[PDB]
Amino acid sequence: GAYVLDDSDGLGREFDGIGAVSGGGATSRLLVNYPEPYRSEILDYLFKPNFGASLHILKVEIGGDGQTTDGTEPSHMHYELDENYFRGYEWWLMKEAKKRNPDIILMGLPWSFPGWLGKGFSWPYVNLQLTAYYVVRWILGAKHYHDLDIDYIGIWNERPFDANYIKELRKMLDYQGLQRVRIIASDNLWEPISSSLLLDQELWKVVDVIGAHYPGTYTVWNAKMSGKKLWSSEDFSTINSNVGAGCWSRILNQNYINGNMTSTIAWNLVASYYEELPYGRSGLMTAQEPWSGHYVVASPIWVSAHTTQFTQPGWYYLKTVGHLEKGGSYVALTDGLGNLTIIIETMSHQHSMCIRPYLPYYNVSHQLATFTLKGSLREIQELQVWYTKLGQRLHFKQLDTLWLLDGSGSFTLELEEDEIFTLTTLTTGRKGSYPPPPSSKPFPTNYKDDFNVEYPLFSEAPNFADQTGVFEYYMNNEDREHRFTLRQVLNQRPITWAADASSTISVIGDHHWTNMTVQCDVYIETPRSGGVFIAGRVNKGGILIRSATGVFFWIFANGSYRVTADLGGWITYASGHADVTAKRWYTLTLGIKGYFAFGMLNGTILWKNVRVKYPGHGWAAIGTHTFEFAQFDNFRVEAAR
Ligand SMILES: *[C@@H]1O[C@H](CO)[C@@H](O[C@@H]2O[C@H](CO)[C@@H](O)[C@H](O)[C@H]2NC(C)=O)[C@H](O)[C@H]1NC(C)=O
Ligand SMILES: *[C@@H]1O[C@H](CO)[C@@H](O[C@@H]2O[C@H](CO)[C@@H](O)[C@H](O)[C@H]2NC(C)=O)[C@H](O)[C@H]1NC(C)=O
Ligand SMILES: *[C@@H]1O[C@H](CO)[C@@H](O[C@@H]2O[C@H](CO)[C@@H](O)[C@H](O)[C@H]2NC(C)=O)[C@H](O)[C@H]1NC(C)=O
Ligand SMILES: *[C@@H]1O[C@H](CO)[C@@H](O)[C@H](O)[C@H]1NC(C)=O
Ligand SMILES: OC[C@@H]1[C@H](O)[C@H](O)[C@@H]2CC[C@H]1N2
Ligand SMILES: [Ca+2]
Numbered sequence: 001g002a003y004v005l006d007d008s009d010g011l012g013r014e015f016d017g018i019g020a021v022s023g024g025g026a027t028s029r030l031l032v033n034y035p036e037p038y039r040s041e042i043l044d045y046l047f048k049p050n051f052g053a054s055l056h057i058l059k060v061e062i063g064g065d066g067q068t069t070d071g072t073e074p075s076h077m078h079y080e081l082d083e084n085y086f087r088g089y090e091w092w093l094m095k096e097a098k099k100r101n102p103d104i105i106l107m108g109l110p111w112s113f114p115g116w117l118g119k120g121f122s123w124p125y126v127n128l129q130l131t132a133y134y135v136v137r138w139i140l141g142a143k144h145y146h147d148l149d150i151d152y153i154g155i156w157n158e159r160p161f162d163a164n165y166i167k168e169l170r171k172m173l174d175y176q177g178l179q180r181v182r183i184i185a186s187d188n189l190w191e192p193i194s195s196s197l198l199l200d201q202e203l204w205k206v207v208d209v210i211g212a213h214y215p216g217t218y219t220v221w222n223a224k225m226s227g228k229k230l231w232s233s234e235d236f237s238t239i240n241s242n243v244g245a246g247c248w249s250r251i252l253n254q255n256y257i258n259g260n261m262t263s264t265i266a267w268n269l270v271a272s273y274y275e276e277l278p279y280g281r282s283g284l285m286t287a288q289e290p291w292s293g294h295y296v297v298a299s300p301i302w303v304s305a306h307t308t309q310f311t312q313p314g315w316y317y318l319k320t321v322g323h324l325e326k327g328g329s330y331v332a333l334t335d336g337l338g339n340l341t342i343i344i345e346t347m348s349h350q351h352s353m354c355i356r357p358y359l360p361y362y363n364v365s366h367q368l369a370t371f372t373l374k375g376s377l378r379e380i381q382e383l384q385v386w387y388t389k390l391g392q393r394l395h396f397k398q399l400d401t402l403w404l405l406d407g408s409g410s411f412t413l414e415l416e417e418d419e420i421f422t423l424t425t426l427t428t429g430r431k432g433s434y435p436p437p438p439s440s441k442p443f444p445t446n447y448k449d450d451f452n453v454e455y456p457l458f459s460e461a462p463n464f465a466d467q468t469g470v471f472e473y474y475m476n477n478e479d480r481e482h483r484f485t486l487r488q489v490l491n492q493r494p495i496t497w498a499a500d501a502s503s504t505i506s507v508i509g510d511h512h513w514t515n516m517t518v519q520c521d522v523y524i525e526t527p528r529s530g531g532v533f534i535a536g537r538v539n540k541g542g543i544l545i546r547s548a549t550g551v552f553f554w555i556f557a558n559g560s561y562r563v564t565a566d567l568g569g570w571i572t573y574a575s576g577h578a579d580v581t582a583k584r585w586y587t588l589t590l591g592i593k594g595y596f597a598f599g600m601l602n603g604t605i606l607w608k609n610v611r612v613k614y615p616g617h618g619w620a621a622i623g624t625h626t627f628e629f630a631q632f633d634n635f636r637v638e639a640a641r
Contacts (some may be wrong), residue, residue, distance in 0.1 A: 001370060002410075005320050005332050005342070008375030012317035015333055016229060016262045017105055018252065018308050020046075020053075020269035020284055022093055023061020024111050024157060025068025025498075025542070026465060027283060031272035032089045033290040033462035041434045042287050042295050046269060047100040051432030052297070053284055053304040056313050058097045059107035059233075059265055060090040061157075062138050065470050066112025066494035067501075068157075070273040070542040072466040074459060076138055078489055080116045085141035087459040087472070094148050105313060107265075108138060109154035109187060113495035122495050125162045132165065132172040139178060149180075154187045154233075157497065158213060161186040163196060163203050170206040182208035187233050190215070194222035209233075212261075214356040217254040219261065229262055236266035236300075238355050239281050242390050245299030246352030248284075249345050249390070249420055252307055253329045257321050266300070274465060274619070276511040278542040290462065292441040302388055302396040302431070303420065310341040310386075310424040327364030328415065330371075340377055341424040344369070348417045351390060364417045373409030381405055386422040386429055396431045443510035448636045452484040461486055467545040469504025469627060476631075482521070482585060485631040488624045498543050501567055505545065505623035507538050509637060514617040516639035519589040522622075523631035524557045527582040531556040531625030532632075536592045536639075538567075539618035551612050553590040553599045556625065557582040563599065563610060573597070574610045585633070 022028045034042065045052035063073030074087040085091065097104050113124045117131055124131045135153065142148040153169070155161045166185060173181050185207045186193040197204045210223055211233025223230055232255045238244035248266065255261040271283035272290075281288075284304060286296040311333050318332040328346030348364045373380055385399040402411055402423065413421065422429075449461055456473045464471055464486070474487035488504050509516075516536045524530035531554055538550040548567040555561045561578040565571035578601060580586060589600035598608040620637045624630045 003371050006374035012319045013262045015315045017056030017313040019055045019057025020266040021059045022269045026071025027268040028272045029465050030290050031287050032458050035293055038293040038437050043096050045297055047097045049101050050428045050430045053301045054308040057105040062108045062110045063088050064112030065114050066496045067468055067498040068111040070277040074470050075114050085145040091146050105151045107152040108150050109157050111157045112497040115492040115494050118495050124495055128165050128168045132169045136172050152182050152184050154184050158188045184209040184211040187211050190220045190223050197226045216357045217258040219259040230260050231263040232261045233265050234267050235264050237282050240298035240300050245303045246347040246390055247354040248300045249303045250347040250352045253331050253345050293438045294440045295437050305396050306420050306422045309429050310426055326367035339425045344421045346415050346419050351418050367415050370412040378409045383423045388420040390418045446638050450634045451486045463508050464506040466506045467541040468501035471506045482633050485633045487631045490627045492627050499546050501545050505621050507541055507619040507621045509620045511618055512641045513639040515593045517591045518620045518637045520635045521585055521587050521633035523585050524582045525629035530582050530628055532630050534588050534590050535621040537616045537618040538621045550618050551592050551597050555580045574607050
């Protein structure tokens with residue numbers, strides 16, 4: 001009936017911000033080679049204040065060279081003694097975010113680690129000081145090379161924590177003059193971190209924030225008892241259709257209401273990875289065609305705006321928040337300066353299901369809600385109104401101002417289903433707008449890369465999405481014809497997060513492709529035992545990369561070749577001998593059409609009319625038999641969709 005908003009009895013918890021994750025894994029892969037001005041426009045929709053999603057927080061993966069959901073991300077230390085703070089795209093993204101919003105909150109979290117840190121085991125806790133040292137170098141590098149202050153550091157994404165590690169990480173941060181950096185744990189479930197904090201005072205002293213993943217809007221008693229800030233440090237992960245925006249809208253409010261969580265962070269920031277990769281299109285917006293410049297400002301962007309444009313880290317939640325009689329919820333926040341923001345959501349069950357978890361049915365129906373401002377809020381006489389309707393339009397439309405002149409801190413609204421209203425004293429709200437970007441277009445049916453870039457802006461060539469291993473621009477001054485190549489640089493399996501393949505692989509192109517010819521120059525660096533391949537119709541990647549099928553044309557340094565149906569190499573289409581050795585450049589061609597494939601070695605036919613599964617479709621790919629050095633050059637693909 002009448003919902004009282006008041007601050008006279010005091011305030012609730014401090015609001016810590018809304019944000020999103022770039023990483024886990026390679027989710028921003030295809031954004032770096034967007035042409036201007038579109039790349040810049042995309043970044044504005046995400047980070048420019050009073051414009052789009054206007055994010056308060058940016059969380060990035062600390063790349064460890066392993067596969068972490070939609071690809072691998074490069075580490076700053078591939079090997080022992082190696083340090084490089086210019087690989088990948090997270091440095092860039094953080095800087096671009098920081099340019100638009102100097103106050104954005106930066107977080108880093110490892111998913112995987114380079115293998116050498118395990119010292120012969122696939123475990124990051126073998127040498128506590130070493131792993132901490134590795135992580136802190138990243139934070140230092142961020143500052144020294146990019147002028148970035150990392151605000152929060154996590155432990156190991158959705159993987160066990162070690163209490164002694166967390167303590168050592170804190171000590172190592174302090175030793176390096178990073179007392180200001182805070183620690184969030186354990187980016188998994190509420191337990192065992194929450195009870196551990198209650199039993200171990202020294203642990204309690206070093207953990208600043210408890211971050212839980214996909215909590216279903218609820219926390220647990222031990223976490224509340226701890227007095228720590230509680231965050232949904234990873235949520236959403238739903239297709240950014242209308243249902244995802246609904247999901248997002250609902251949890252943004254109810255994470256605080258039901259669970260005392262004062263921050264929520266969406267996986268992921270922007271869908272800039274092939275859609276046929278795991279969890280495709282589960283970013284706040286979509287930017288998966290750098291070749292065309294086409295992007296989509298999806299519904300979740302505006303749902304975010306309803307909170308982010310009208311709140312900032314350091315505002316406080318009111319004590320008076322809750323559910324509406326006929327379903328839906330409201331929160332309210334102030335900045336202790338006379339501003340008030342109110343965010344109301346009526347997401348229906350049928351249009352707001354998140355993937356994790358799925359909620360039992362609940363009812364929303366037409367209702368009236370009366371709001372009364374008590375205490376220090378009585379003096380508000382005017383509120384701006386922002387409105388969104390999900391289902392088929394209207395997104396973030398500014399409605400007519402409401403007046404509260406009646407002397408009665410009150411007003412009423414007619415609420416229907418699947419709506420959002422924001423009511424705030426702030427006048428800075430804006431539905432940012434750029435002209436529409438180019439229409440959607442398939443990946444180019446003819447495509448070439450000779451990797452001849454002397455000072456590349458990024459460490460890897462556009463569109464190649466590593467799914468196991470790490471491929472990088474490589475300069476070899478001692479060769480002329482192959483001065484500039486692409487190289488696989490991992491020489492041992494990472495401390496994996498996912499089940500990485502046993503073979504390295506990078507995929508590219510149009511998953512819809514069915515008939516195609518792929519050609520590449522290859523160079524095996526490891527004598528006797530080394531091997532490389534080129535492939536087409538590759539149908540799975542990311543977390544599922546081990547499961548990839550397609551047509552794989554392998555050559556080996558022992559003078560042999562194989563054609564397989566799978567990356568694992570368990571199913572043979574053909575095999576034989578070849579004039580092939582290490583440390584020599586060969587041109588490989590693989591032609592797939594209908595039921596049949598053929599392979600060429602240096603323009604000469606090696607095998608032909610070999611029967612392959614059909615129908616089938618997928619990407620082109622390159623890679624190596626194990627985690628081994630190899631080079632690639634003059635890549636070309638002609639394909640039919
Ligand atoms: C956690 O949030 C809950 C709300 O979910 C807060 O508890 C409410 O407290 C009021 C009175 O203080 C009760 O009338 C409500 O019934 C409580 N809510 C529920 C759902 O039972 C609580 O203050 C928060 N815990 C903290 C801040 O430690
Ligand atoms: C609401 O918030 C705005 C923005 O923070 C406040 O306006 C600022 O007030 C400070 C001092 O209180 C000034 O130094 C800034 O220049 C102001 N900025 C802007 C953009 O106006 C405002 O005081 C708050 N209260 C109300 C009633 O608007
Ligand atoms: C890929 O190649 C196959 C094999 O040639 C094509 O299938 C043929 O298509 C023609 C006309 O479209 C038919 O007359 C043949 O009977 C088909 N043969 C088989 C075995 O299916 C297929 O159309 C090609 N697809 C693309 C997208 O180019
Ligand atoms: C939802 O509530 C309305 C009124 O309370 C009722 O008429 C309707 O049948 C309910 N829907 C379900 C599925 O229970
Ligand atoms: O919903 C899938 C999410 C992403 O894949 C992130 O990488 C982590 C791992 C699972 C979940 N959080
Ligand atoms: Ca070259």
